[PDB]
Amino acid sequence: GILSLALKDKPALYSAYMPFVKGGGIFVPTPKRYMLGDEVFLLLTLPDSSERLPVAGKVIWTTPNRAAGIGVQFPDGPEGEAVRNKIETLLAG
Amino acid sequence: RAEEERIERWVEQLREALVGDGFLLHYQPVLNLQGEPLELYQAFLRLERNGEMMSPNAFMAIAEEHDLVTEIDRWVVARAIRQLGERQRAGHKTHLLVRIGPNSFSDPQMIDTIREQLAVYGVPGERLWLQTPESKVFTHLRNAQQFLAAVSAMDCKVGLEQFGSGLDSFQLLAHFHPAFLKLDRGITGDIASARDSQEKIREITSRAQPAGILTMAEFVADAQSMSSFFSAGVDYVQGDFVAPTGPLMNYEFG
Ligand SMILES: Nc1nc2c(ncn2[C@@H]2O[C@@H]3COP(=O)(O)O[C@H]4[C@@H](O)[C@H](n5cnc6c(=O)[nH]c(N)nc65)O[C@@H]4COP(=O)(O)O[C@H]3[C@H]2O)c(=O)[nH]1
Ligand SMILES: [Mg+2]
């Protein structure tokens, strides 16, 4: 269904953000279990911001290390490059 | 430069996977619509780190920065054939579709590896299907022809994925005879509900059938898609409607 992830500070962002992923990614904890290349809808709130960014992404990591979730790959369209740049901006601050 | 140590954490994990356990393969059924049922699966690479599974979209980006893609595609092909071997020992005549890259056109080790492994596992080359996109086959043509000829010299099947796309594709077809075509998702996603698409497709199949070229559709998700692909003569279909991807070959085709 609907995933959500709220990063309050640049540390939580850096722990979620997967920079080496092809086109950026983000680790979203979820109890629910997904298979790789499953197509998810995620609502990503960045720190130092209140806007919920809408990410229609792909699973590229299943962890059941730390945390119990899924890696969500950002779409290669402009709409996803946008969120990747927002985040990369936030982290070199 | 803080992250540069994390990059190497990843790269060492990768090379140790190249040489030992870590890499694995998952298998999605490809289904013959028209009705010559063939045990056919497409193989997907995966990486496992203490129960943490991960998708080549996570790590291929790094791997390319280290000209490591060729050794990986060698692993894919090789374990794929070992799996064909275990699969022949069970008494199944199973086929495996395998993504390879264009650098492996230049890979003499790949042509060796294919040969060597079919021999030991006693696998007819027509069990192996290697696919590579129309994009990178365009960029790298002389090598692609060399490779197709060498590999089809082993009764292997060679095909194009992400086919369709642009108008340069039927141009390439003059210079390249593959066993099969995998239609680009942009074409086939909407065929349920367009006129652009099914126009394009029946054009592609009408040209493709008599050449002896197999047409296959990817990312099938709904039934109207399948009736369109069927009425349209597409040969093979795979996707979450058809059958999902797993680590065991267990689909009852027919
Ligand atoms: N092809 C295909 N995929 C379907 C279909 N239905 C669902 N999927 C899923 O959606 C993803 C599509 O892969 P891709 O976008 O072509 O992009 C793939 C591809 O670029 C790459 N990849 C996957 N397997 C291999 C492999 O054996 N070798 C190489 N070199 N790359 C691979 O990893 C990407 C991620 O694949 P996955 O994480 O396994 O996740 C796959 C797969 O699990 C279908 O009908 N066809
Ligand atoms: Mg094993």
Author numbering:
A (entry chain B): 9 to 72, 78 to 106
B (entry chain A): 436 to 689
Sentences from the paper on this structure:
We also crystallized the complex between PilZΔ107–117 and a larger FimX fragment encompassing its GGDEF and EAL domains (FimXGGDEF-EAL, residues 255–689) in the presence of c-di-GMP. The PilZΔ107-117-FimXGGDEF-EAL complex crystallized in space group P42212 with one copy of each protein in the asymmetric unit (see S1 Table for data collection statistics). We name these two modes of contact interfaces 1 and 2. We note that the binary complexes employing wild-type and D46A/E47A PilZ seem to be stabilized by the addition of c-di-GMP. Together, these observations raise the possibility that interface 2 between PilZ and FimX EAL domains may be physiologically relevant.
Type IV pili (T4P) are thin and flexible filaments found on the surface of a wide range of Gram-negative bacteria that undergo cycles of extension and retraction and participate in a variety of important functions related to lifestyle, defense and pathogenesis. In Xanthomonas citri, two cytosolic proteins, PilZ and the c-di-GMP receptor FimX, are involved in the regulation of T4P biogenesis through interactions with PilB.
